[PDB]
Design a binder for this molecule. Structure first.
Ligand SMILES: O=C([O-])C(=O)[O-]
Ligand SMILES: O=C([O-])C(=O)[O-]
Ligand SMILES: O=C([O-])C(=O)[O-]
Ligand SMILES: O=C([O-])C(=O)[O-]
Ligand SMILES: [Ca+2]
Ligand SMILES: [Ca+2]
Ligand SMILES: [Ca+2]
Ligand SMILES: [Ca+2]
Ligand SMILES: [Mn+2]
Ligand SMILES: [Mn+2]
Ligand SMILES: [Mn+2]
Ligand SMILES: [Mn+2]
Lengths: 289, 289, 289, 289
């Protein structure tokens, strides 16, 4: 109904429906505009993608609050009445003060939700901090969203599986739940059985499945994830990866054959249309221009 | 030889060789990193692409100095010893004071060159200002690059063909040349004959051909452009367009079939490798980490 | 009551009270934090000050949307429950598309209101555009705040007095009023009589008096302005000017006598306290840190 | 001689003279422009000041690379031929990858030098990391400035005195020296005797004295510091503190008496003059405007 109400919209989807919320991972204006064009009900802003696109760098804690907030603020608000945005917030970019600032900035920027992880600050796409230090992050985040009277959906992410194992992950999610996290994310399942098991272990508290295209986790389909009981599923590299493959293929053709060769329906005007040309023309015409 | 010497490198290519300098149009870190991966000798930063990707908006004078400089600064310097970057600088983002500031900022940011046009400030991918007002822009730009003792390659772009015709375009380029522009860009040729004619009219002053993929200008190949006498050729939508087509195709598959389906060789690690993973690991390992 | 409700708060002050709303002109975090420390009920973000502080440049259309929005976003939200912020929005930074984007960004950023002027885009602290072109700006701005269902207070500023005279100013304000502006600002009165006259001419539509410290307009006190019927009074250079005088005096002492000599009660900790140390410590302590 | 050669200029002052290099601490465009107006030969950009002014926050690791680089880039380049800028770089904003990125960005931005400290990432205006972890930072920084063939002056700062004592500080500086730091900074001396002692302990390797106005370190005059053997002296709060006192005094007067009362010589035009009005007018006039 109201503009900039992504958090309320996501919260409604989570609490008022049983649907699996499918969130394509977007990383810039073009990828986000394309997801919106196609009618996705929620979007996900990847940190890895944001770093690659906005900074041309690997996902090694190089993007910080300013870059992440700027990208999320841009994407969340392309349409003030558009789909909610879940955004990576990494480790919160510092201690509790920075976690709170991050949540506050995301909330202000119309971001619907974000995932906060237990990696050491010098993180990567892997060591984690203590359970207690993780919970300091979660507490700082929850207190902020409450202080701000926001419906912001905080997703507690654990990267502990690799180094600490399943039980530890489940216990961290349970602890995070108690501190006020709204959704859990056990990063990098090793098997589909294990994914269903984590859902069962934490039910009825909602989980989010992070599908990493061409990564090191099992390929789980949307229908498989829904049947498993997941409530959100994000697709981290859903746009960055095909963008790279296409850009590379095209530039190789340009290099070797002196032509770009992009299907002719992809015109500048169509691109502008995807990126809000109509809205802009309406503004201009409406203003008496 | 030296880091951040893109301007010198481009200048050398222009003055010390007869090669057609082929510049794929890039718009973010991923597109730029891909062009670099493939060994292009010079890159072009599109304004339309920058606006679509960094802002999710159409090319309607929405991106301003800060966005354009930030993107160019990022791209030009991904490799301090990398290929020169020619960047769109639109109309200079204001009067002479802003044109000068823009050139100064681009120069400081390691940008090798930029094209400056005669469109009215409220520009678009079309009305132009008077010849005199255009020359005020060119003069402000040239004086700046000279004041800064820079090899910065200033490209004088004219969008006058549409509304004023060929002769007017040629005269504006001649005037711009005299004010100190290094290269001319007659935007949007209507025919290959006309493109060769503009080159002949301004010889031996170098021209740059702007190829717009799927646009409204004749399809000219690299070999055709070289034979015509052009010295630079940029490919405005060379990466933005195929990126869109691929992202869209992928998201449609995700929407309809619940899987992303990106060829499996495009892994997160490969993407990180393209985006400077090795450099980063070298830094960390080298620092005793 | 609610966080980020500056627009509602300003609107309430305007519509629900007869008080003269006194807004000290602030330009950075320190000046804003000081105004807040002292209990001002509303703040004003100067464009000239923003340009001097964030960019080190004169008020010559050098700061653009990104700089202005970033500064306003920072200041408005230092306290989510703090005083409303009226921010300079100059000419809207472009055509109607940019005016709308500017208003949209200010609204999103919690800004309570802004003044929009009729200067030519290449403005200064003086030529104005036609009445019709001005109204295109106003219309774009009003349509945006309505589209966004916002209480944003749009102040229509006219700089026409200098070149066009009083009657023209009054007519522009009347026109702006009809297009939906909430408050009028006749910039640079020449006399106190003329200021009272403009109020009378537009009553009961509220006016805002812009007091420029050490400028070329009559010195009007708060009590004088209230008696004249003004509803808002901003103090453009209220913090930038004394900051400069003090910084200069201090640096001269440092240069000549080798000591800074700042009264000893102005400690780093006091400065941190003014700039939100307590809030930060509360966050950290509260998070279990 | 050449534009953007702050690093070379600072390096020359350090290596080719025996003068104490006096650097007033500046934090925005106005403070920097004032220091330049008065002829200081080098400027210092305070992190605390940058955080207070650009962010309105306390010096608690809230400003990150983007804010710090943006401020330093702005200040260093107000005059391409102006005085060198030494800028706070805190802990490097992350692990070795971020330290290197920070140094690279500062170098690109014309920054002459920077101090890098051994505080834990969650720093403050106090715990320090291990000697080895500190040296990882220093190594990353030195390798970067070398890779970039830059004269950048790296200042190794130690905050270890408080928790670890004098000997530890001296040993860290010696280690940092060996890893390639150009200057040492023992933060927060407890006595003048101890300051002279640190200089003697590290001679002939240059030290920098950080004078914190109204802080918890002894008041040392410029002449005292020179006699002690220091080669650089920075004045952290030299402009932020008097700015606050003046802004506060003024706003209190405005609040209580309805007038600003700033000495009348501090006009908008004078402020614009201090902030580069002449340069701007020269650009405009020169461009044929
Ligand atoms: O950055 C990402 O794409 C993530 O964390 O899933
Ligand atoms: O923006 C662009 O891509 C251009 O101007 O060629
Ligand atoms: O910029 C300002 O301070 C104004 O417009 O009053
Ligand atoms: O931030 C500062 O001012 C410092 O570290 O001296
Ligand atoms: Ca094609
Ligand atoms: Ca695949
Ligand atoms: Ca003192
Ligand atoms: Ca005065
Ligand atoms: Mn991530
Ligand atoms: Mn363009
Ligand atoms: Mn203004
Ligand atoms: Mn500091």
């Amino acid at each position: 109904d109201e503009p900039f109400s992504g958090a309320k919209k996501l919260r409604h989807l989570l609490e008022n429906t049983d649907e699996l919320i499918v969130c394509p991972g977007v990383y810039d204006g073009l990828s986000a505009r394309t997801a919106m064009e196609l009618g996705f009900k929620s979007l996900y802003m990847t940190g890895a993608g944001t770093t690659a696109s906005r900074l041309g760098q690997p996902d090694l804690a190089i993007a910080q609050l300013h870059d992440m907030r700027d990208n999320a603020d841009m994407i969340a608000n392309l349409d003030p009445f558009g789909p909610p945005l879940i955004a990576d917030m990494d480790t919160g970019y510092g201690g509790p003060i920075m976690v709170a600032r991050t949540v506050e900035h995301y909330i202000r920027s119309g971001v619907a939700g974000a995932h906060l992880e237990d990696q050491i600050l010098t993180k990567r796409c892997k060591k984690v901090v203590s359970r207690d230090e993780y919970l300091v992050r979660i507490r700082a985040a929850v207190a902020t969203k409450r202080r701000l009277r926001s419906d912001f959906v905080l997703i507690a992410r654990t990267d502990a599986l690799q180094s600490l194992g399943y039980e530890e992950c489940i216990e961290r999610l349970r602890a995070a739940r108690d501190e006020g996290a709204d959704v859990g994310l056990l990063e990098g399942f090793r098997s589909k059985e294990q994914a269903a098991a984590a859902v069962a272990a934490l039910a009825p508290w909602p989980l989010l499945l992070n599908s990493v295209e061409n990564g090191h986790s099992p390929l789980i389909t949307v229908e498989e994830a829904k049947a498993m009981g997941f409530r959100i599923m994000i697709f981290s590299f859903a746009t960055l990866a095909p963008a790279y493959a296409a850009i590379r293929e095209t530039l190789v053709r340009l290099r070797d054959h002196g032509v770009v060769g992009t299907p002719d329906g992809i015109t500048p005007v169509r691109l502008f249309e995807v990126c809000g040309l109509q809205d802009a023309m309406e503004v201009d015409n409406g203003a008496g221009g």
